[PDB]
Design a protein around this ligand. Structure first.
Ligand SMILES: *[C@@H]1O[C@H](CO)[C@@H](O)[C@H](O)[C@H]1NC(C)=O
Ligand SMILES: *[C@@H]1O[C@H](CO)[C@@H](O)[C@H](O)[C@H]1NC(C)=O
Ligand SMILES: *[C@@H]1O[C@H](CO)[C@@H](O)[C@H](O)[C@H]1NC(C)=O
Lengths: 50, 50
């Protein structure tokens, strides 16, 4: 819930909070969408997705 | 069978799996589908790419 800069092996600075993240299949890390905007990334060691 | 250099149109479902495909070099209907980039074509007359 703050304007942060995350480095989940890639750099981008936005805000963060908890995601449902239904669409995570086949060893996925970042849940991109149309126009390549980044949302729904997961912790690289745990399974929780923000 | 042997592979050839061709142009294909691919579709992805809600789970991220390929469910349909169109070979654009088969018939004029497939060429029309690949020109407008849709699996459903309405009634009319359209110009197609080679
Ligand atoms: C990765 O190691 C950290 C401690 O460095 C631990 O908290 C975390 O649970 C570990 N993850 C796995 C999947 O073992
Ligand atoms: C997508 O995957 C889920 C996994 O539980 C499955 O239940 C569902 O039927 C799949 N959707 C389609 C359209 O196949
Ligand atoms: C488009 O074509 C598919 C395949 O025949 C058909 O099942 C579907 O209902 C059609 N979609 C629309 C929007 O008409």
């Amino acid at each position: 819930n703050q304007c942060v800069n995350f480095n989940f092996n890639g750099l981008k600075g936005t805000g963060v909070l908890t995601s449902s993240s239904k669409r995570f299949q086949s060893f996925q890390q970042f849940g991109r969408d149309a126009s390549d905007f980044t949302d729904s990334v997961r912790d690289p060691q745990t399974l929780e997705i923000l | 069978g042997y592979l050839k250099p061709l142009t294909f149109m691919l579709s992805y479902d809600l789970n991220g799996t390929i469910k349909n495909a169109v070979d654009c070099s088969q018939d004029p209907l497939a060429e029309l589908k690949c020109t407008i980039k849709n699996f459903n074509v309405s009634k009319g007359i359209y110009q197609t790419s080679n």
